[PDB]
């Protein structure tokens, strides 16, 4: 049976429920001649999966009192009557044998708000539970403990002082809370003493505790399937991949290749991404020492085909934070009334991750600057614009959620979203010229076989004004003709590498996806604020 | 047991329930000598938690008559006849013991509108009470009282002269009306001499009947928590201010704000805007006698229409944790729905809940998505969206009473707001916040950091005279870029400085990447008004 030892992982919300039930029973001498009744009703709320129904089973066997269990739809039945009599027959059973705690579950399902539903019995179950807790000299020896994941769906006359007072929040444990979860579900398992768990507490962030139990259970099935003895870190490293916690189950991002080695030349842009998403996660004490808010997410703009969503994939598989991918205008719906909740529930799950990064590519379909200024198209869809404006900075407190945007031109983007605090980084990625065109050919040919030493400087000399996608199909067409002689291997291809063979017919087709007139729109900004303005 | 001295709050409505259930039974020679027969019991309604079940407890002990308890859904059976047989045998039970009182708790469970329901056996139960309270001859001396919180879902054939005479509305107490509710819920407790209950009544607005009983319950638990380290104690206001943080939201639990606070000193440059915004809230709450002496309604509507970046949406976070009022937050279009009824009823259930917890301040951020009224059907904006505007027009002023609710609006485009809202009575205090000048740029940086070492020997006036035409948000990017390079010079191998001593070398590269957000062409749209 579980107890006060297996309930660990929280201290602030655990001591509130221990002095609410056990302390009036183990020490009743100070609650007399003091004038106040002890609190009698405990209701917890939060995300589903944090163990809101486990804690009632832990305090049942620790106090040593009578315990009752009531399910949600187990009381509801036909032959009108007995949907209220079964609630009456359980409170009178707990009325005797003092003290006696009673656990009612699924208050989100039964007893809803009265004026928001249409149910004939539902007006009677929500009011029979009222008179059973504070009626005419009731609430003598019973203690009602509830567990709900949706507190906004219950009746507003239920969270009052007589019935369910002194509310508690069971949230996601992140400020040194994940480590105590791993020390409970592993003391019964055999573990080889060769690794530490201190660095494993900061690997995942969006875990609810039940997912931490899923991480140790994933490594258990990987251990017995590779030995077909204990457990080792290589089974837990397989549990870190394809993790997918319950808070971010709707969005999957773990489908891309490895990164950090395909990009090249853009060292001042890659290092800017390291100083934004790794600083508040790896060193949180440096920000609290200064007492300042960290820098927010980035925004990418420039020529199409420069490497603006592969760099967003570079922060998808390298950093320890989570990822939520939105494929452009994916969160738009045909209904007028919904039209904001897909923007909300992405950012609602983002603030519950603590921390994570999101990606909103093609911001021209997302920003849509001002519907009053545009009348020639007749859009005026300023509802989804103002919803994104009140979710990144907004009203509530910041919980380290970074937003990454990729577009091509910033003239169709609203200046209200271009301000710092929401999207502060306005970096422009340039075109490679004589410095970044040599390191890209070694980065995109990393896992590829090569011949003895061939110079790649002459490829950069011929290609002038070429984008990053324009440097693709120069070497991709080389691998297209590198398998042409493999078809002629019939009666083994005796060349396991790529020799030249292509630049007499592939380098002569200097294809430019970006025109000269289209490049003039990017080279027009030139931010007018310069350096050398310090004090003297 | 409880009495009439153990029940406070309303007093004019206390006498109308004592002259009806005690006065015909104690003084019976006034009705038969002159006038018609005395009236029957009333139906108590109102918000939940105002002392409407404790009110029926005091008449069950001080009157001394026969009392029988009947709950709403307690009278139920799977049989056909016993759904109403227990109501019939209880009314003749109190008829045998004359006089007697009957309390029907939660009568809305067993008395809805008969024309709305269809195909049940509860329509036999609601028609049983029409012939049991005032039937053929079955009404002599018994009186039946009830306590409910929803009078709208009661049939109109139950509230006539025979059955239920008056609809007593035990509402929210007022100034020097919520002082007596706290004193009698703390009398049996041991207190010290430094407590002052008149100071608590001015800082408890939505605390009506049970939250004021939960404030004394949570502060008593905090005294036990600090005593765990026979013995007498004494409460000394250290835990009343602790329990005042989260004890209000009985009705406003859905719209709780947490936990942003700036403590009225993280904002700078707006010296005249802070004194104008505070005086519209501090005056109608702290001095109610000065407004009823002049006989004029105060100013309530505040609207911010400056450019984005000057500090306008977190300025409502300053009034969220400083003034003594409840805060309701509407984060843009967070309440519209595709059900054709909940698109405008979400406006309705917020404002009367705000009118219940008077006084309070609501916050309507990004009104460009709410006040789109004069364009329709304009291609893609969609029709039938002006009903949320016309509902918003009837809740600012409407046809209601002055309940001292305060509306704060934040928008970045003043030309897209509905001009029907832009009028006094709904939003009268239109204040434009400009970009901070060189005299306000010295008070903008010391309020941002407030906890960092400023390198004593340095001067910050060089940033004030330079970087002209910058908003308040762009100057937060400069102090974050300098802190970005400050921790960059401290993440190396320490085998450098174990001190957060940020110098001018970190601000040298911060001014290079600092850019202007509000353009020169965008600034002329706000200056084109000149009102």
């Amino acid at each position: 049976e579980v107890g006060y030892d297996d309930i660990g992982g929280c201290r602030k919300q655990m001591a509130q429920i221990r002095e609410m039930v056990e302390l009036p029973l183990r020490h009743p001498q100070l609650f007399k001649a003091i004038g106040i009744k002890p609190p009698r009703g405990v209701l917890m709320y939060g995300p589903p999966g944090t163990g809101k129904t486990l804690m009632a089973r832990a305090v049942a066997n620790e106090t040593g009192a009578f315990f009752f269990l009531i399910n949600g739809p187990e009381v509801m039945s036909k032959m009108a009557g007995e949907s209220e009599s079964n609630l009456r027959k359980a409170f009178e059973e707990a009325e005797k044998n003092a003290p006696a705690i009673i656990f009612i579950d699924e208050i989100d399902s039964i007893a809803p708000k009265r004026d928001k539903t249409n149910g004939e019995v539902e007006r009677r179950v929500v009011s029979q539970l009222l008179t059973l807790m504070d009626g005419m000299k009731a609430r003598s020896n019973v203690v009602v403990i509830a567990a709900t994941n949706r507190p906004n769906s219950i009746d507003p006359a239920l969270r009052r002082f007589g019935r369910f007072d002194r509310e508690v929040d069971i949230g996601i444990p992140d400020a040194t809370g994940r480590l105590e979860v791993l020390r409970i579900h592993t003391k019964n398992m055999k573990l080889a003493d060769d690794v530490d768990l201190e660095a494993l507490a900061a690997e995942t962030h969006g875990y609810v505790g039940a997912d931490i139990a899923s991480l140790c259970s994933e490594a258990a099935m990987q251990q017995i399937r590779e030995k077909m003895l204990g457990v080792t870190m290589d089974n837990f490293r397989f549990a870190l991949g394809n993790s997918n916690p319950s808070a971010l189950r709707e969005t999957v991002v773990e489908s891309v290749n490895v990164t950090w080695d395909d990009v090249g030349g853009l060292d001042e842009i890659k290092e800017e991404l390291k100083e934004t998403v790794e600083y508040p996660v790896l060193h949180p004490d440096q920000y609290t020492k200064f007492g300042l808010s960290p820098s927010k997410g980035v925004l990418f703009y420039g020529p199409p085909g420069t490497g603006k969503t592969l760099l967003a994939k570079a922060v998808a598989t390298e950093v320890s934070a989570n990822f939520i991918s939105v494929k452009g205008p994916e969160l738009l719906s045909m209904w007028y009334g919904e039209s904001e909740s897909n923007i909300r529930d992405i950012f609602d799950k983002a603030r519950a991750a603590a921390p994570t990064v999101v990606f909103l590519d093609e911001l021209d379909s997302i920003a849509k600057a001002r519907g009053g200024s545009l009348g020639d198209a007749g859009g005026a869809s300023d509802r989804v614009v103002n919803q994104l404006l009140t979710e990144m900075d907004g009203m509530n407190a910041k919980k380290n959620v970074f937003v990454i945007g990729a577009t091509n031109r910033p003239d169709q983007i609203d200046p209200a979203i271009l301000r710092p605090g929401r999207l502060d980084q306005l970096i422009y990625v340039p075109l490679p010229d004589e410095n970044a065109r040599l390191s890209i050919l070694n980065a995109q040919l990393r896992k590829t076989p090569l011949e003895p030493g061939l110079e790649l400087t002459a490829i950069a000399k011929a290609t002038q004004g070429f984008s990053g996608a324009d440097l693709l199909y120069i070497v991709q067409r080389a691998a297209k003709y590198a398998i042409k002689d493999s078809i002629e291997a019939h009666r083994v291809d005796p060349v396991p590498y790529i020799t030249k063979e292509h630049f007499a017919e592939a380098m002569k087709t200097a294809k430019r996806s970006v025109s000269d007139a289209e490049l003039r729109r990017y080279e027009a900004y030139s931010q007018q604020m310069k350096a050398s303005r310090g004090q003297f | 047991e409880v009495g009439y001295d153990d029940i406070g709050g309303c007093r004019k409505q206390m006498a109308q329930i004592r002259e009806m259930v005690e006065l015909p039974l104690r003084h019976p020679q006034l009705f038969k000598a002159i006038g018609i027969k005395p009236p029957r019991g009333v139906l108590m309604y109102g918000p939940p938690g105002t002392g409407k079940t404790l009110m029926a407890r005091a008449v069950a002990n001080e009157t001394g008559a026969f009392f029988f308890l009947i709950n709403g859904p307690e009278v139920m059976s799977k049989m056909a006849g016993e759904s109403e047989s227990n109501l019939r045998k209880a009314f003749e039970e109190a008829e045998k013991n004359a006089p007697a009182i009957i309390f029907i708790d939660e009568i809305d469970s067993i008395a809805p509108k008969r024309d709305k329901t269809n195909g049940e056996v509860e329509r036999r139960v609601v028609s049983q009470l029409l012939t049991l309270m005032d039937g053929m001859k079955a009404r002599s001396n018994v009186v039946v009282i009830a306590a409910t919180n929803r009078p709208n879902s009661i049939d109109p054939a139950l509230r006539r002269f025979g059955r239920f005479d008056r609809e007593v509305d035990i509402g929210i107490p007022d100034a020097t009306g919520r002082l007596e509710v706290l004193r009698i819920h703390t009398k049996n407790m041991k207190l010290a001499d430094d407590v002052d209950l008149e100071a608590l009544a001015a800082e408890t607005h939505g605390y009506v009947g049970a939250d004021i009983a939960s404030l004394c319950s949570e502060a008593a638990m905090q005294q036990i928590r600090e005593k765990m380290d026979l013995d007498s104690l004494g409460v000394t206001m250290d835990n009343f201010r602790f329990a005042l943080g989260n004890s209000n939201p009985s009705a406003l639990r859905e719209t709780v704000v947490e936990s942003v606070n700036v403590t009225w000193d993280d904002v700078g440059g707006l010296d005249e805007i802070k004194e104008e915004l505070k005086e519209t809230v501090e005056y109608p709450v702290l001095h109610p006698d000065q407004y009823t002496k002049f006989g004029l309604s105060p100013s309530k509507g505040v609207l911010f229409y400056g450019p984005p970046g000057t500090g306008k949406t977190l300025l409502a976070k300053a009034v969220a944790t400083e003034v003594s009022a409840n805060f309701i937050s509407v984060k843009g279009p967070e309440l519209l729905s595709m059900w054709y009824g909940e698109s405008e009823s979400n406006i309705r259930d917020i404002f009367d809940k705000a009118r219940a917890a008077a006084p309070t301040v609501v916050f309507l951020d990004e009104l460009d998505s709410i006040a789109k009224a004069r364009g329709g059907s304009l291609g893609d904006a969609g029709g039938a969206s002006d009903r949320v505007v016309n509902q918003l027009l009837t809740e600012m002023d409407g046809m209601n009473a002055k309940k001292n609710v305060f509306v704060i609006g934040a928008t970045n485009r003043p030309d897209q707001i509905d001009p029907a809202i832009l009028r006094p009575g709904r939003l009268d205090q239109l204040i434009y916040v400009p970009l901070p000048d060189e005299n306000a740029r010295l008070s903008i940086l010391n309020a941002q950091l407030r906890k960092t070492p400023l390198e004593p020997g340095l001067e910050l006036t060089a940033i004030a005279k330079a970087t002209q035409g910058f908003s308040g948000a762009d100057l937060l990017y400069i102090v974050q870029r300098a802190a970005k390079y400050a921790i960059k010079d401290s993440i190396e191998a320490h085998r450098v400085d174990p001190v957060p001593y940020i110098t001018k070398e970190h601000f040298a590269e911060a001014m290079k990447t600092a850019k202007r957000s509000v353009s020169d062409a965008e600034l002329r749209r706000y200056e084109a008004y000149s009102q």
């Binding site: 036909k78 032959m79 009108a80 009557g81 949907s83 249409n118 149910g119 004939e120 019995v121 045909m334 209904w335 007028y336 009334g337 039209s339 007749g378 | 799977k78 049989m79 056909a80 759904s83 049940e120 056996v121 595709m338 059900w339 054709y340 698109s343 291609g379 893609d380 969609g382 029709g383 039938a384 969206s385």
Partner: peptide, 24 residues
């Protein structure tokens, strides 16, 4: 262009509950 402003719920026939008359 045109966005639907309503879902328009028009259904739902609720529960029932029987009245078991005793036999003897």
């Amino acid at each position: 262009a045109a966005a639907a402003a309503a879902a328009a719920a028009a259904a739902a026939a609720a529960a029932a509950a029987a009245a078991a008359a005793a036999a003897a």
